Amino acid sequence: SEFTTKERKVEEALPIKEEIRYDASLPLGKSYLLQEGKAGKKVSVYQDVIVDGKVMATNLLSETVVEGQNRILVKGSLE
Amino acid sequence: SEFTTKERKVEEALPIKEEIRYDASLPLGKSYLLQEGKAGKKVSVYQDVIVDGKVMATNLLSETVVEGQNRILVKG
Amino acid sequence: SEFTTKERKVEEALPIKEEIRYDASLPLGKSYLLQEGKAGKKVSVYQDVIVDGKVMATNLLSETVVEGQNRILVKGSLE
Amino acid sequence: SEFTTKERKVEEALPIKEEIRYDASLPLGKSYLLQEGKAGKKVSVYQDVIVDGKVMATNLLSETVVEGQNRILVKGSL
Amino acid sequence: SEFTTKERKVEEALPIKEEIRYDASLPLGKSYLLQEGKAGKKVSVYQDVIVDGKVMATNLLSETVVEGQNRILVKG
Amino acid sequence: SEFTTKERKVEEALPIKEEIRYDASLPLGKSYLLQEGKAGKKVSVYQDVIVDGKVMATNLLSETVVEGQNRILVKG
């Protein structure tokens, strides 16, 4: 039987990193977010082998990890 | 040891559907793009069980399919 | 005339899935619910085109399947 | 001089515990929240003895500490 | 693989609290039992993560100490 | 003074992944090469913060690993 190949890209969102920053200006229990931050990214490129319309196997071609944007939490205390 | 859990969202682009239409008013051999396709996507959210910094298992939580638009080609 | 658009989500409850487990400590003919379980749902997001106060067309934007929580039945015999 | 007995359930939120970790690769003076943290709870069951409408005494039947979750923070280090 | 959870309960007897009163001016050297004293019990509730039919990790959900009674002893 | 940033690309060869497949068939202390290895390629993009013309520090912005080819040997 013959075969064919096709590439697939799968994106996994990385956990948002949250920075806790201290600001002496804020009261004791007062805190706000400086920025919401965007999730980082883990992109994998795969290659599938197709035999009779079925993926018979797959190889991982590459894996790229891109840092995201931090979520910044600003509070009036230093932990 | 102890364990924690976390959410994991994974996106997969779906193969674009391509319809082929025909037009006699058009010379055979000619092909026009009546509609550029748009790839839909499959978004999966999983729940990973983390032990000692390592994911030891995962359960599917939800599976979403964002539709997308068919590619349409007219051939004389 | 002019038009407006609006999104609406439709939720269809999914049949609860029930798992049957064997408990050697249970007497024959005796069983109990270990987990009532919850129904999964199929959520579809649609977009409507409204003309003069009446839906004139709709597109299916998304189709999601949210897994439910299994109903767990434990009994003192093995089916 | 006859008596009756009564039970009471008392609850109070426990303070979230916070662990501090260090990472050499992280910039000194920068902190990242690893785990939010959730408050535990202490549930106490007491028993009172009532004589002539007043509580003459009370015993502690049980004490349950419903475990919460630690707050985990990582700090950059040299 | 997928995972599942399960809750375990575990009872453990606690040491018996000791108490020592002191008199009626009893011949210093002798002693009488004032109270039998029973052990208190700690009840721990755990939740195990199961993967491929094996507990891979466990967390403590709660800890209950059911108070006992002291063994009171009167010494002269 | 003020500061600016610049990004730098760095590529590295990854240590070849060694795979050993045993076979009770073939004799003692004998080994055959099933597949030659090929190193994976790691491409990291860094961001340098520059003050007064000099790099004071640098952060990692993205890391790509282009999988290689395992070297497979039959032992046993």
Q: What is the DSSP string of E27-56?
A: -BTBEEE----B--EEEEEEEEEESSSSEE
Please answer whether residues D38 and D2 qualify as being in contact, where contact means their C-beta atoms are separated by less than 8 angstroms: no
Contact A4, A54 (CB under 8 A): no
The shortest C-alpha distance from F11 to chain A (Å) reads 13
Which residues contact residue F28 at a Cβ distance below 8 angstroms, ignoring those fewer than 6 apart? none
**Counting Cβ atoms within 10 Å, is residue C16 exposed (0-12), middle (13-18) or buried (19+)?**
middle
Q: How many CA atoms lie within 13 A of E35 on its CB side?
A: 14
Provide the resolution (angstroms): 2.5
Distance from CA of B53 to the nearest CA of E (A): 12
Q: Which chains touch B (3 or more CB pairs under 8 A)?
A: A, C, E
Which residues pair with residue D23 across a beta bridge? D76
The conformational region for residue F53 under phi > 0 = left, psi -120 to 50 = alpha, else beta, is left
Per the rule left: phi > 0, alpha: psi between -120 and 50, beta: everything else, E40 is: beta
User: How open is the CA angle F34-F35-F39, to the nearest 5 degrees?
Assistant: 155
Q: Which chains touch F (3 or more CB pairs under 8 A)?
A: A
Query: What approach was used to elucidate this structure?
Result: X-ray
What does DSSP say about strands C71-75 and D3-13: parallel, antiparallel, or unpaired? unpaired
Q: What's the gap in Å between the CA of C43 and the closest CA on chain B?
A: 9
DSSP state of C19: E
Distance CA E8, CA F51 (A): 59
DSSP C27: P
Would you state the structure tokens that stand for residue B56, as one six-digit string?
């030891």
Using CA atoms, how far apart are residues A33 and A18, in angstroms rounded to an integer? 10
Chain A residues inside the 8 Å CB shell of B11: 10-13
What is the amino acid identity at position E10?
V
What is the total count of domains within chain E?
Answer: 1
Measure the CA–CA gap between C18 and C37, rounded to whole angstroms.
8
What phi, psi does A54 have (nearest 5°)?
A: -120, 135
Measure CA A37 to chain center: 12
Specify whether the CB–CB gap between F71 and F39 falls below 8 A.
Answer: no
Which chain A residues are Cβ-neighbours of D33 within 8 angstroms? 18-20, 73
B34 touches chain C (CB under 8 A): no
CB contact under 8 A, F61 and A66: yes
| Concatenated DSSP letters of chain A | ---EEEEEEEEEEPPPPEEEEE-TTS-SS-EEEEE-----EEEEEEEEEESSSSEEEEEEEEEEEE----EEEEESS--
Q: Which domain holds residue D76?
A: 1-78
Do residues A24 and A77 make contact, with C-beta atoms less than 8 angstroms apart?
A: no
Contact status, residue A67 vs residue F60, Cβ threshold 8 Å = yes
Structure tokens at F47: 């961001």
Length of chain A equals: 79
* Cα E26 to Cα E36: distance, rounded to the nearest angstrom: 20
The rounded Cα D74 to chain-centroid distance in angstroms is: 23
**C15 φ, ψ (degrees, to nearest 5):** -55, 130
Structure tokens at C53: 């106060």
Task: List residues bridging with E3 in a β-sheet.
Answer: none
User: Do the Cβ atoms of E44 and E10 come closer than 8 Å?
Assistant: yes
Which stretches of chain F are assigned E, i.e. beta strand?
A: 3-13, 18-21, 32-35, 41-51, 54-66, 71-74
Exposure string over C19-43, b if 16+ CB within 10 A, otherwise e = eeeeeeeeeeeebeebbebeebbeb
φ, ψ (nearest 5 deg) of residue E30: -105, 165
DSSP class of C52:
T
- Give the C-alpha separation, F13 to F41, whole Å: 5
The full 3-state SS of chain D, as one line of letters, equals: CCEEEEEEEEEEECCCCEEEEEEEEEEECCEEEEECCECCEEEEEEEEEEECCEEEEEEEEEEEEECCECEEEEEECC
CB of E38 closer than 8 Å to CB of E5 = no
Residue E61 in contact with partner chain D when CB distance is under 8 A:
yes
Q: What is the CATH number of the domain that holds B40?
A: 2.20.230.10
Is the CB of residue C67 less than 8 Å away from at least one CB of chain B?
A: yes
Q: Are A42 and A11 in contact (CB under 8 A)?
A: yes
Residue with tokens 């005494």: D57
**Strand-pair category, E71-75 with E18-21:** parallel
| Whether F73 contacts F31, CB under 8 Å | yes
Pairing of strands A41-50, A55-66: antiparallel
Return the closest-CA partner of residue A19 out of A43, A7, A35. Answer: A35
Interacting residues of D77 by C-beta distance below 8 A, sequence separation 6+: D22, D23, D24, D26, D28
**Which residue's entry shows tokens 């002893």?**
E73
Exposure string of A29-62, with b = 16+ CB inside 10 Å and e = fewer, is: eebeeeeebebbbbbbbbeeeeeeeeeeeeeeeb
Q: Report the alpha-carbon distance of residue C68 to residue B59 in Å, rounded.
A: 11
**Cα–Cα distance for residue pair D35/D38, rounded to 1 Å:** 9
User: Hey, of D17, D20, D33, which one would you mutate to test binding to chain A, going by the most A CBs within 10 A of its CB?
Assistant: D33
**Spatial separation of the C-alpha atoms in residues E58 and E9, rounded to whole Å:** 12
The answer to whether F66 contacts chain A (CB < 8 Å) is yes
Q: Which of B8, B49, B54 to mutate to test the interface with E (most CBs of E within 10 A)?
A: B49
Q: CB under 8 Å to F35, separation ≥6 — which residues?
A: F69, F70, F71, F72
- Distance between CA atoms of residues D36 and D72, nearest Å: 7
Cβ contact (<8 Å) for D31 and A17? no
d(CA C45, CA C42): 10
> CB–CB of B65 and C62 under 8 A?
yes
Cβ pair E72, E31 in contact under 8 A: no
From edge to edge, which strands make up the β-sheet containing C4-13?
C4-13, C41-51, C54-66, B54-66, B41-51, B4-13, A4-13, A41-50, A55-66, F54-66, F41-51, F3-13
The answer to whether E68 and E39 have CB atoms below 8 angstroms apart is yes
Type of residue numbered E12: E
Q: What is the DSSP letter of F19?
A: E
DSSP 8-state secondary structure symbol assigned to residue B21: E
